[PDB]
């Protein structure tokens, strides 16, 4: 019971560390600017769209090379739930809210990115196989 | 909170003359992990029951067999007379095709809460000390 609590504390410390990361800020937008984020970046693993306090949180879609949109998994982070973090780095993004649309462009797309050798969202936490078997 | 994932389902399809599908929203998950079973009706942006979009009434699938059968019969009669019912069966067999509703991604909808939702076991309030 004790060594597991220690491991949990270490894991939370390591996740909250968030050290040695590089941020891409070269994002452009064009479309219905009234649903635009106030900030968009990515750290090579996830893409973050930050929205103001009065803005409705829109739906965000993944655009491929031919222009077809597709769903991408999402998590809402931030102190006020103001940041939509999508789990992919992409060159183009689609934001929709009702009958408005805004296109977000990644102007520094890195086709390689950082490999996920650990199985978590952090390089300092390892996902290990408990199930054995 | 905002950004909470609501999950629902529909079934049964439309009937002739209908342009809205009943959608039931089943559960919502808050970004912080709170989960409550709301079994509520899904409505449009102004609370009109069902989700509605663009309707495909399948005109050609319903009527083109009968139309083409009639046109072939009439053209055949024209040709035969120029020497010097199947249409009703096709219609009977392909007339009852229910419509299909298409609704785009990213549209606004409502959930009208159908039951009282109680959050007393997952939240509590504490005063923030000043300064």
């Amino acid at each position: 019971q004790t060594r597991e609590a220690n491991a949990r504390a270490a894991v939370e410390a390591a996740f909250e560390q968030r050290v040695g990361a590089y941020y891409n800020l070269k994002y452009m937008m064009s479309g219905d600017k009234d649903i635009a984020p106030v900030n968009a970046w990515d750290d090579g693993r996830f893409t973050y769209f930050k929205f103001s306090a009065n803005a409705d949180l829109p739906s965000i879609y993944f655009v491929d090379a031919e222009g077809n949109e597709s769903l991408v998994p999402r998590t809402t982070v931030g102190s006020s739930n103001n940041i939509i973090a999508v789990h992919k780095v992409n060159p183009k993004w689609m934001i929709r809210l009702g009958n408005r649309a805004l296109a977000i462009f990644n102007e520094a797309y890195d086709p390689n990115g950082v490999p996920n050798d650990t199985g978590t969202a952090s390089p300092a936490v390892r996902r290990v196989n408990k199930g054995g078997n | 909170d905002r950004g909470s994932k609501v999950v629902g389902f529909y079934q049964g399809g439309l009937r002739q003359g209908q342009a809205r599908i009943f959608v039931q929203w089943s559960r919502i998950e808050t970004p912080s992990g709170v989960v409550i079973n709301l079994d509520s009706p899904g409505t449009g942006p102004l609370g009109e029951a069902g989700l509605g979009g663009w309707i495909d009434r399948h005109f050609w699938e319903r009527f083109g067999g009968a139309i083409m059968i009639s046109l072939i019969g009439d053209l055949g009669d024209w040709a035969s007379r120029q020497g010097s019912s199947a249409a009703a069966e096709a219609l009977r067999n392909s007339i009852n095709i229910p419509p299909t509703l298409y609704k785009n991604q990213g549209e606004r909808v409502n959930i009208l809460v159908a039951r009282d939702l109680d959050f007393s076991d997952v939240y509590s309030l504490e005063s923030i000390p000043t300064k």
Partner: peptide
Amino acid sequence: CASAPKPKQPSDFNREPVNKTVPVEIQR
């Protein structure tokens, strides 16, 4: 003869940076 309409395609004319400032989440 008719198919379901696509959603609105945004206009590619008013292209501008998203970031007028630097987010505080970057610690900047």
